[PDB]
Amino acid sequence: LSGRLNWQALAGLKASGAEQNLYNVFNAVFEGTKYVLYEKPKHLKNLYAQVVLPDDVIKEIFNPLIDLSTTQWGVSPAFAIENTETHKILFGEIKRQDGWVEGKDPSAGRGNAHERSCKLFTPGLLKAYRTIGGINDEEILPFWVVFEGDITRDPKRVREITFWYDHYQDNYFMWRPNESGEKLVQHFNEKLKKYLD
Amino acid sequence: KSELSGRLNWQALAGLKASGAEQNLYNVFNAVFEGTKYVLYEKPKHLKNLYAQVVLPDDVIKEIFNPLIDLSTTQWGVSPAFAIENTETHKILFGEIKRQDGWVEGKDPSAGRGNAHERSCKLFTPGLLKAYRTIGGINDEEILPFWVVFEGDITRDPKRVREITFWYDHYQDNYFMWRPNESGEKLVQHFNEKLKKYLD
DNA sequence: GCCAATTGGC
DNA sequence: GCCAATTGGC
């Protein structure tokens, strides 16, 4: 099964003048390929209820009338890309945020909600992602964060995120204003697709 | 490393408790550190200069906003909620305080839907981990260089407590749940028993 | 200049 | 059930 992408279908989406977002872009480029996109995938929805808490903690917290054995508490990624042959999955997030850009003061980029995406660096979620998605190669992280909005052109935010990721520079992508869906797909195609093999 | 050489001032903390004064992380640690080699910093400045000189490829520079300032002397960084330094060894533990509501008695489950506490996870990025270990001096692999103290109803929320427990995996001592009504002693005991030795 | 942490959205 | 990501605050 070739891993070639459907650039013709993507060009049609672009030509249809339709506003491109991550979903219609990957949906178009994956048509007839061995890849499929999921919006709000459910693979990681059953992680927390089964967590074993010391009896000392149980006594100190609120214990609702609930059957934890059948309770599914977990996370809901913005999206996931699956190679339907190997069934390996890359889970992703989309962080949209304003930023300090031309004509604005630094305060326009003072927001910090994007830090929330760093929950993916916790050892527990890294372990869960690797187990469920199948990407065990230590060379890359098992998630992909796509940033959107003026934060992607903010001199401070861009350097901050670059600093955070350190040697995992391909695990995030800055999808800048007015940029084509093609560049978003090229990042996946050139830097991440091989890890689903 | 004798126990006496690092004994905390438990009597000063008991005095604070006996005074009836409202306890918070700062007055609790300031009291317990009285006369010792440890000092607590509120908003430490050790990590004030981190990002401005980060190198960006020419093809990225071309696509971003480049302000007309001198990045070589610009200080962009972070400001931890607190830090604990052993002034004899100069090793430092950096900390955060995350207060948040939660699903507890008398509340609808929606009271625990909040997720801003996730921001604290920035400390797990490889970049900040390296910066924290370099500055604070803690390279022991079995412990992380930071300590996140949670406060508020989130500390008793059945889903949030399990979520955070899960996140931390085998680094359970790198966070502490300071519950409503809990005194300062429990907070200090966590540091004393699980983290203080990493400042030796 | 940097962090708080919430209420509304899907 | 779980995520969006902002504006207020010092």
Side-chain angles (χ1 to χ4, degrees), chain A residues 97-111 149-159, chain B residues 52 63-71 74-76:
Chain A
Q97 201 163 292
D98 289 331
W100 168 34
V101 297
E102 32 292 89
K104 308 189 182 296
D105 273 10
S107 61
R110 72 186 187 281
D150 285 340
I151 184 174
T152 64
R153 296 189 63 256
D154 179 314
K156 181 183 305 185
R157 294 276 158 261
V158 168
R159 288 182 175 84
Chain B
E63 308 304 322
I64 67 167
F65 165 53
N66 295 288
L68 295 161
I69 62 179
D70 182 358
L71 294 178
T74 294
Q75 298 188 38
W76 294 334

Side-chain angles (χ1 to χ4, degrees), chain B residues 43 113-116 118 159 163:
Chain B
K43 195 176 180 185
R113 73 185 183 277
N115 59 355
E118 292 169 354
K159 176 193 296 195
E163 166 192 49

Side-chain angles (χ1 to χ4, degrees), chain A residues 45 74 76 95-96 98 110 113 116:
Chain A
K45 272 292 290 89
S76 297
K95 290 293 139 160
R96 309 186 184 78
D98 289 331
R110 72 186 187 281
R116 288 180 42 239

Side-chain angles (χ1 to χ4, degrees), chain B residues 4-5 15 62 75 78 83 87 106 137 179:
Chain B
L4 177 65
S5 63
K62 183 168 186 173
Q75 298 188 38
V78 299
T87 62
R179 300 186 166 95

Side-chain angles (χ1 to χ4, degrees), chain A residues 6 49 59 84 168 179:
Chain A
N6 202 331
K59 299 160 187 171
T84 62
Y168 297 101
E179 273 318 311

